[PDB]
Design a protein around this ligand. Structure first.
Ligand SMILES: OC[C@H]1O[C@@H](O)[C@H](O)[C@@H](O)[C@@H]1O
Length: 477
């Protein structure tokens, strides 16, 4: 029923912009998020990644925290603009930036912690966006990304777990359909002077796939022979249930939703084509790969990186969807035809807990993609009103304890009962941190960070719950 293999990797996850602070220190150049946060109205509490958890200066304390919690693994990202402040292949490299991360990894390894390193977690160097529209220029972006990646592969050979992109769905849809995330492109001219919500998202997804696959080929050809290790992309995606369990169109739409959200990226990576359902709806707004691109992209995951948070009921729509539609001509809802609920609210409008969906989606993905090795690179939750609670109540985060309990056991059943090859689980997040367009109000941390008192760390009940939870699941031999 529930049991995990002895080598199982587990720990916590973070991202550079969300935690590091020191946004102008040691040569770092601006990212598209530094710029986006300077624009009134884009961040709900008017804040930015300035200061954040001050983790750039507190690596030693953060490592000691990981060790105190029992983690054997830690996922973090590299700020590209600390490595190449302007980002490009002909721009000057910042050795201080490199040395910071090389040392960090030496120190993690010395503490007995396996590093999982994300190259790109949304913080595109601003200059690349300004020069050529960043992801919108296929050849320029792929060349600059591959160059950046090779610098990191060469400098950090002790890392054996590399992630290219985090959640390209976010970068494409939220960055170029709705403008909710940097760089804020949308057709809506009351929010952005540039963008085309019907066309730019699909170009952005396409070109990220190309860049990913170049970085993977570089890793496999020039580094893996002598350094070993593995590389893949991390995709997010939520589970689906039919709004009307008797309606075959809703049942079909549960698959279609997942195809538009995840298979957009995974079908190219495993099969060398986009989902037929996407081709049908988007037609020539969805780019086509050339034969050379198909060969490059197909087979470009050593493992499947999975981020997962929630589930939705799916209600099919009829007729022709608007050109700005990205869901696949359907509606997502938290209540079904019979008034059944996904789960209670959290601080995030889009997140309700549903552990069964995690198990369901693990199965769906494993079946569609031939049982790849899966690392769960993010899973966790916010808690409604957490930012307003007194300390004693914040630390007693029973709701979050429960989220991890149910989601981790659901995953363990996916493994031991359903045969899914999950080999790691990284809790989002080690620390309360900057939650993008929501600012600091939305807390995902297993560790409370007191921003008013020098970002002092207090482990919550959840933080201490994970080690005994995994002790109950991971086989000794
Ligand atoms: O309507 C788009 C919404 O979709 C959700 O799944 C995203 O995570 C939100 O961050 C976003 O604003």
């Amino acid at each position: 029923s529930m049991s995990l293999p002895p080598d199982f990797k587990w720990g916590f996850a973070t991202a550079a912009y969300q935690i590091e602070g020191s946004v102008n220190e040691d040569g770092r150049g601006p990212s598209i998020w530094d710029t986006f946060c300077a624009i009134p109205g884009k961040i709900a509490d008017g804040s930015s990644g300035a200061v954040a958890c001050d983790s750039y200066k507190r690596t030693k304390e953060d490592i000691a925290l990981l060790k105190e919690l029992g983690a054997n693994s830690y996922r973090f990202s590299i700020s590209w603009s600390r490595i190449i402040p302007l980002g490009g292949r002909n721009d000057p490299i910042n050795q201080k930036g490199i040395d910071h991360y090389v040392k960090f990894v030496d120190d993690l390894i010395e503490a007995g912690i396996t590093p999982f390193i994300t190259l790109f977690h949304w913080d595109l160097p601003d200059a690349l966006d300004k020069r050529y529209g960043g992801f919108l220029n296929k050849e320029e972006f792929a060349a600059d990304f591959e160059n950046y990646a090779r610098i990191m592969f060469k400098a950090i050979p002790k890392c054996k777990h590399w992630i290219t992109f985090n959640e390209p769905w976010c970068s494409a849809i939220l960055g170029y359909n709705t403008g909710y995330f940097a760089p804020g492109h949308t057709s809506d001219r009351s929010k952005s002077p540039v963008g085309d919500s019907a066309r730019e998202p699909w170009i952005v997804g396409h070109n990220i796939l190309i860049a990913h696959a170049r970085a993977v080929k570089a890793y496999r050809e020039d580094f893996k022979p002598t350094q070993g290790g593995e590389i893949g992309i991390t995709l997010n995606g939520d589970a689906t249930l039919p709004w009307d369990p008797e309606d075959p169109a809703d049942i079909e739409a549960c698959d279609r939703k997942i195809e538009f959200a995840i298979s957009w990226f995974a079908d190219p990576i495993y099969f060398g084509k986009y989902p037929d359902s996407m081709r049908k709806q988007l037609g020539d707004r969805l780019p086509e790969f050339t034969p050379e691109e198909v060969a490059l992209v197909k087979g470009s995951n050593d493992f499947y990186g999975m981020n997962h948070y929630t589930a939705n009921y799916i209600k099919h729509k009829t007729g022709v969807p608007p050109e700005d539609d990205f869901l696949g001509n359907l509606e997502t809802l938290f209540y079904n035809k019979y008034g059944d609920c996904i789960g209670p609210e959290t601080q995030s409008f889009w997140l309700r807990p549903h552990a069964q969906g995690f198990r369901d989606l693990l199965n769906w993905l494993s079946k569609r993609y031939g049982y790849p090795k899966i690392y769960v690179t993010e899973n966790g939750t916010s808690l409604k009103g957490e930012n307003d609670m007194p300390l004693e109540q914040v630390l007693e985060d029973d709701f979050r304890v429960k989220y991890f309990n149910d989601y981790v056991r659901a995953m363990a059943a996916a493994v031991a009962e359903d045969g899914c090859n999950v080999r790691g689980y990284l809790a989002w997040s080690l620390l309360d941190n900057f939650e993008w367009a929501e600012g600091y109000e939305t807390r995902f941390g297993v560790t409370y960070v007191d921003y008013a008192n020098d970002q002092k760390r207090y482990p919550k009940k959840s933080a201490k719950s994970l080690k005994p939870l995994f002790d109950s699941l991971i086989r000794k031999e």
